[PDB]
Amino acid sequence: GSSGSSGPFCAMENQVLVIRIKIPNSGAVDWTVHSGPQLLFRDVLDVIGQVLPEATTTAFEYEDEDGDRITVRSDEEMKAMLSYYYSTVMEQQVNGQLIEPLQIFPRSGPSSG
């Protein structure tokens, strides 16, 4: 996680984040994320690792506006994925419909050295 919290409070203006890891033939798990903004790529992998311990991940995908399923292989992509969720989430609120969980998929592959 975040080494060096210094103060068990966790500040955040925007509501917490909820990541929905698409589980293989087992529904999906919701990773209660409070540091939606203060989230790193590794963190995700650090979490997923607990979700799919028998199935590596490293990276993950997330449906965008055109539901083209993006790919996050670098913190860069992450900030992006989050940049969309919030850009869309806020839109889901102004509209009315309830907000949806950041539907992500643990890119599990065969290789794993």
Side-chain angles (χ1 to χ4, degrees):
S2 273
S3 172
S5 60
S6 55
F9 224 41
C10 214
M12 65 221 133
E13 281 178 72
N14 213 110
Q15 264 234 249
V16 300
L17 162 94
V18 181
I19 294 167
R20 162 179 176 197
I21 295 100
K22 253 301 246 97
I23 313 262
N25 275 93
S26 247
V29 166
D30 83 289
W31 166 33
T32 164
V33 182
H34 304 235
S35 264
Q38 202 177 21
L39 186 68
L40 295 166
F41 182 59
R42 302 299 213 171
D43 270 36
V44 178
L45 293 327
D46 266 290
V47 175
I48 290 178
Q50 307 233 64
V51 181
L52 279 74
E54 344 202 69
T56 298
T57 294
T58 316
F60 43 97
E61 295 204 65
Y62 89 78
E63 265 159 286
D64 212 48
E65 65 175 61
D66 249 26
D68 203 10
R69 294 267 191 75
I70 323 304
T71 292
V72 183
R73 294 185 281 186
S74 88
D75 196 28
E76 210 162 67
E77 279 123 73
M78 243 268 280
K79 278 206 288 276
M81 170 183 80
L82 286 145
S83 248
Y84 157 86
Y85 185 70
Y86 303 151
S87 191
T88 214
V89 158
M90 87 88 131
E91 279 176 27
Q92 276 231 108
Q93 303 210 40
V94 316
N95 243 254
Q97 49 208 343
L98 272 159
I99 305 297
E100 295 278 287
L102 188 45
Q103 188 174 353
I104 64 164
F105 305 79
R107 259 192 82 268
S108 330
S111 303
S112 177

